[PDB]
Enzyme design. Structure first.
Site, mmCIF file in Angstrom:
data_model
loop_
_atom_site.group_PDB
_atom_site.id
_atom_site.type_symbol
_atom_site.label_atom_id
_atom_site.label_comp_id
_atom_site.label_asym_id
_atom_site.label_seq_id
_atom_site.Cartn_x
_atom_site.Cartn_y
_atom_site.Cartn_z
ATOM 1 C CB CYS B 13 -0.942 -0.026 1.183
ATOM 2 S SG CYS B 13 -0.316 0.530 2.791
ATOM 3 C CB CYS B 16 7.102 0.561 4.240
ATOM 4 S SG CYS B 16 6.310 -0.821 5.421
ATOM 5 C CB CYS B 111 3.582 -6.013 3.020
ATOM 6 S SG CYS B 111 2.097 -5.183 2.928
ATOM 7 C CB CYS B 145 0.654 -2.296 9.192
ATOM 8 S SG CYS B 145 -0.112 -1.934 7.816
ATOM 9 C CG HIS B 183 0.395 -4.923 28.698
ATOM 10 N ND1 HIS B 183 -0.625 -4.273 29.307
ATOM 11 C CD2 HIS B 183 0.749 -5.830 29.741
ATOM 12 C CE1 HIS B 183 -1.028 -4.644 30.386
ATOM 13 N NE2 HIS B 183 -0.271 -5.672 30.728
ATOM 14 C CB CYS B 186 0.972 0.829 27.578
ATOM 15 S SG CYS B 186 -0.664 1.535 27.524
ATOM 16 C CB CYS B 211 -6.587 -0.155 30.908
ATOM 17 S SG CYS B 211 -5.982 -1.711 29.964
ATOM 18 C CB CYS B 217 -5.872 -2.771 24.012
ATOM 19 S SG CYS B 217 -3.953 -2.411 23.994
ATOM 20 C CB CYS B 226 3.728 2.261 19.600
ATOM 21 S SG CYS B 226 4.028 1.180 17.986
ATOM 22 C CB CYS B 238 -2.661 2.922 18.784
ATOM 23 S SG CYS B 238 -2.017 2.554 17.029
ATOM 24 C CB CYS B 245 -2.238 -2.190 20.406
ATOM 25 S SG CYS B 245 -1.084 -3.089 19.503
ATOM 26 C CB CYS B 248 -0.370 -3.274 12.937
ATOM 27 S SG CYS B 248 0.930 -1.823 13.437
HETATM 28 S S1 SF4 Z 1 -1.079 -1.842 26.299
HETATM 29 FE FE1 SF4 Z 1 -1.976 -0.231 27.461
HETATM 30 S S2 SF4 Z 1 -4.085 -0.098 26.721
HETATM 31 FE FE2 SF4 Z 1 -3.374 -1.995 26.191
HETATM 32 S S3 SF4 Z 1 -2.200 -1.154 29.607
HETATM 33 FE FE3 SF4 Z 1 -4.206 -1.490 28.714
HETATM 34 S S4 SF4 Z 1 -3.875 -3.500 27.482
HETATM 35 FE FE4 SF4 Z 1 -1.762 -2.675 28.291
HETATM 36 S S1 SF4 Z 2 0.442 0.580 19.158
HETATM 37 FE FE1 SF4 Z 2 -0.595 0.719 17.048
HETATM 38 S S2 SF4 Z 2 1.937 -2.054 17.370
HETATM 39 FE FE2 SF4 Z 2 0.628 -1.192 15.526
HETATM 40 S S3 SF4 Z 2 1.191 1.122 15.566
HETATM 41 FE FE3 SF4 Z 2 0.036 -1.391 17.982
HETATM 42 S S4 SF4 Z 2 -1.401 -1.289 16.324
HETATM 43 FE FE4 SF4 Z 2 2.019 0.098 17.616
#
Ligand code: SF4
Ligand code: SF4
Ligand code: NFU
Ligand SMILES: [Cl-]
Ligand SMILES: [Mg+2]
Lengths: 598, 270
Positions: B13, B16, B111, B145, B183, B186, B211, B217, B226, B238, B245, B248
């Protein structure tokens, strides 16, 4: 040889192949035939990729669909997600809250600006600008040119231009030309003076740095760019002013406003003036080719209503124009089975009956890769493709059987037509167009010491220059619109409405046991639609008809040509082995091939 | 002498390539002008058709075993490979040709790394990741992705500075960027740890940044940068912008059930 749509097609002449077509998204092959004087007399558009997203969607949850279809394209990123959530909301009778509406609009207009400006500088510019001629420019005269083209642009001193020139000079003299390797530099197809070339190259480098700032709007509302997140029923970015812990607070909104103000400055001081100046100089050279179907047939679904869910207030009002009659806009209904239809007569797909076109609620996507008897080469080594048979992964969309051009130029022609019949929502595009015509015809020529011309909009717009111009103007208009959307969003939040999602029909236990919907979007390259059928909580059918599907389409059952093929017709090439003119005109549509085929 | 990079495009797509040019540190402008020599790349290159194809031959000859092959997208095996055609031939033939003299191969994105969306069921083109087609060459997988812009330029920067592929985990991903689960760091973790969850979109919990586990998630099973590095010069990710999440950067994430279905066995992730 045959005649269609006022074009006399003839394949008797010398065959020229461009594969790959570069500086596009995705994969395209283009073939032409030229006559004894190197004029194009036949053109063949081949989409050379397919993934089958429509097939992959079957059986999945409609709430997830936006994420899958978003990956149709990373360039027009998010416009498919928007179409998808709109289609599902349409099927399930979901009305989203005002803040979700405005945030989606802001995201869409951000994409428009990012996509248009990156396209022009990074993909299109090298068809008009000779980078090697920029090496020979006088820095002082480049500064003087800059101040004429765009007085308000602050980055305009002779030393700034000389510095940019020296970095380019060093890059070239290294013997590793990178993206400029084996280019067509020095072709007589290039008409700009050295100073204009250096100005354009400088802006190329400026735009490349600035474009990463604009997309931070997507990152705030949608988490990331490319591929921001969407949601059926609204937006995920919940609002709270009075924590640090909400996705959207006043500090985040102030950050978005700062990015919007930067966009407005760039469009007004860099992008629009560059396109007007380059357009003027190619107009002076008489290069008014590439009109194709824009001279007759144009279409857009209409977008950006002042009042949510009220199509009469569309700020880019749509419809269809036929036969160059700008005094009559036909309304376009994506729900009408006799309007938007797709043929596969000359595409690598199969229908029960390929003499008919299918509306997308009844669409079928079954691959059928097979080559015609007149092919030169083999199934896995094509030398010359056979356009009398199946020759593309792109379907052939038609509107009531008519071949149409879509895109910013189509929208600006539609806006102009609507304005002249008394639609006041189209007033700004009309103003932009009249301003542009006066700059191209009078102001810029006078400033450069060229003779003034008297082209009407009717003459100027249906051309490769006009198509490129409309894109730049649309960028400017989109920036202006999202500035107003921001104020409306902040006002609505301050008045006490913090809602971002309608979850009343989130759970599939609330859904009708079957349903159908359609979502339309004015995507950067034109008219986008997604058509969904839902059965027992699952996707039954999902069909996309995408802007580059319209523009890049192969011939239909009647043998009518699409926009790309029509636009290349009757164009002289300086050197038939150097595809400069082919690339200039194809690139003016901003072809998105992954989009076109999905 | 800047290292030549030949950047091929299969079924993709282009997310990248787009992510690459979002890099703030370093600028993509500086990467192309001062770090690498980006000699073939369909999205940016001046030459087309026969003039573009001729570059591949020239670079492979002159820099034999001393150019990087970067691959965005992937080769299809169905339709005799002609669901992705380049110069009238299947993409798989171009990939195999350019791979043979490469000193290193970068599989950009999900991909190239795993298959991504076109490889989701029922995979009508039999789109296949690069490492299943090229089996005799050193490959680095940079999934996502798309992947984060700074991860992409980070990998390039490491390779150019050191003339080495960075240390990889057992899935071929660079440990410098893919060692943590989303996680792990996060910022919503203290809510997860206290059992404070969003149950419906735009509920009071969502406005407090609770959360997103119960909204689907997939951060607990997804490896990427991320949560810490974040996206677009550390602006958001995200979860910060309110969506779980979707996983991806992980192999086969499209076919791990609905994105809004919660992971089972929450105690697992405490
Ligand atoms: S990565 Fe952050 S929102 Fe998803 S603490 Fe809640 S399930 Fe882990
Ligand atoms: S936080 Fe967004 S792994 Fe893909 S950008 Fe998970 S889906 Fe980061
Ligand atoms: N604009 C755009 Fe895409 Ni990559 C096309 N054609 C659209 O939906
Ligand atoms: Cl995957
Ligand atoms: Mg379709």
């Amino acid at each position: 040889a045959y005649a269609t749509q006022g074009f006399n097609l003839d394949d008797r002449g010398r065959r020229i192949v461009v594969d790959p077509v570069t500086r596009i998204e995705g994969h395209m092959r283009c073939e032409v035939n030229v006559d004894a004087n190197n004029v194009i007399r036949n053109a063949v558009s081949t989409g050379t990729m397919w993934r089958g997203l429509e097939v992959i969607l079957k059986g999945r949850d409609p709430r997830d669909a936006w994420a899958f279809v978003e990956r149709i394209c990373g360039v027009c990123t998010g416009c498919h997600a928007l179409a998808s959530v709109r289609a599902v909301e349409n099927a399930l009778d979901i009305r989203i809250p005002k803040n979700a509406h405005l945030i989606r609009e802001i995201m869409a207009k951000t994409l428009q600006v990012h996509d248009h400006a990156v396209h022009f500088y990074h993909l299109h510019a090298l068809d008009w600008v000779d980078v090697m001629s920029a090496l020979k420019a006088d820095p002082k005269r480049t500064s003087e040119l800059q101040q004429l083209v765009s007085p308000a642009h602050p980055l305009s001193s002779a030393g700034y231009f000389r510095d940019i020139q020296n970095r380019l000079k060093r890059f070239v003299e290294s013997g590793q030309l990178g993206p400029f390797m084996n280019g067509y530099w020095g072709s007589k197809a290039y008409v700009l003076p050295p100073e204009a070339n250096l100005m354009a190259v400088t802006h190329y480098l400026e735009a490349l740095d600035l474009q990463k700032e604009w997309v931070k709007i997507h990152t705030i509302f949608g988490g990331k760019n490319p591929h921001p997140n969407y949601l059926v029923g609204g937006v995920p970015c919940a609002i709270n002013l009075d924590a640090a812990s909400a996705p959207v607070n006043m500090e985040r909104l102030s950050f978005v406003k700062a990015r919007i103000d930067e966009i407005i400055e760039f469009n007004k001081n860099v992008y629009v003036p560059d396109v007007l100046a380059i357009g003027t100089l190619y107009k002076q050279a008489g290069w008014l080719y590439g009109g194709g179907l824009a001279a007759t047939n144009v279409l857009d679904y209409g977008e950006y209503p002042n009042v949510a869910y009220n199509k009469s207030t569309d700020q880019l009002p749509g419809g269809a124009i036929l036969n160059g009659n700008w005094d009559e806009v036909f309304p376009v209904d994506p729900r009408d089975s006799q309007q938007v239809q797709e043929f596969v007569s000359h595409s690598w797909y199969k229908y029960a009956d390929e003499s008919v076109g299918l509306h997308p609620w009844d669409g079928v996507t079954e691959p059928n890769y097979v080559l015609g008897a007149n092919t030169k080469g083999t199934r896995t080594r094509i030398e010359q493709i056979d356009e009398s048979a199946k020759y593309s992964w792109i379907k052939s969309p038609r509107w009531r059987g008519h071949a149409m051009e879509v895109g910013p130029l189509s929208r600006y022609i539609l806006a102009y037509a609507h304005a002249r019949s008394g639609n006041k929502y189209a007033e700004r595009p009309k103003e932009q167009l009249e301003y542009s015509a006066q700059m191209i015809n009078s102001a810029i020529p006078k400033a450069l010491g060229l003779p003034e011309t008297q082209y009407t909009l009717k003459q100027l717009l249906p051309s490769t220059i006009g198509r490129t111009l409309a894109r730049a103007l649309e960028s400017q208009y989109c920036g202006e619109m999202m500035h107003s959307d921001w104020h409306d969003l902040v006002a609505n939040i301050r008045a006490g409405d913090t809602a971002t999602a309608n979850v009343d029909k989130w759970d599939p236990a609330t859904w009708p046991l079957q349903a159908k919907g359609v979502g339309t979007v004015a995507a950067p390259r034109g008219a986008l639609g997604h058509w969904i059928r839902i059965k027992d909580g699952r996707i039954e059918n999902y069909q996309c008809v995408v802007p580059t599907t319209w523009n890049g389409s192969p011939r239909d059952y009647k043998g009518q040509i699409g926009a790309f093929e029509a636009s290349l017709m009757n164009t002289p090439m300086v050197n038939p082995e150097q595809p400069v003119e082919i690339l200039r005109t194809l690139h003016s549509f901003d072809p998105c091939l992954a989009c076109s085929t999905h | 002498p800047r290292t030549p990079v030949l950047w091929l495009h299969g079924l993709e797509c282009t997310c990248c390539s787009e992510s690459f040019i979002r890099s703030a540190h370093p600028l993509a402008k500086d990467v192309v002008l001062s770090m690498i020599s980006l000699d073939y790349d369909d999205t940016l290159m001046a030459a087309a058709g026969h003039q573009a194809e001729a570059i591949l031959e020239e670079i492979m000859t002159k820099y034999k075993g001393n150019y990087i092959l970067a691959v965005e997208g992937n080769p299809p095996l169905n339709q005799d490979g002609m669901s992705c055609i380049i110069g009238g031939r299947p993409f798989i033939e171009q990939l195999k040709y350019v791979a043979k003299d490469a000193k290193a191969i970068i599989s950009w994105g999900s991909c190239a790394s795993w298959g991504c969306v076109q490889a989701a069921k029922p995979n009508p083109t039999q789109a296949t990741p690069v490492h299943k087609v090229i089996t005799d060459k050193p490959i680095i997988k940079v999934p996502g992705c798309p992947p984060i812009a700074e991860v992409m330029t980070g990998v390039i920067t490491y390779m150019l500075t050191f003339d080495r592929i960075p240390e990889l985990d057992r899935q071929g991903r660079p440990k410098m960027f893919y060692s943590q689960r989303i996680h792990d760091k996060c910022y919503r973790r203290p809510h997860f740890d206290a059992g404070q969850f969003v149950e419906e979109w735009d509920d009071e919990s969502a406005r407090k940044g609770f959360c997103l586990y119960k909204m689907g998630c997939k951060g607990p099973t997804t490896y990427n940068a991320c949560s810490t590095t974040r996206w677009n010069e550390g602006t958001s990710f995200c979860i910060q912008s309110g969506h779980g999440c979707i996983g991806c950067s992980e192999d086969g994430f499209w076919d791990k059930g609905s994105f809004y279905d919660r992971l089972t066995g929450i105690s697992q992730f405490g």
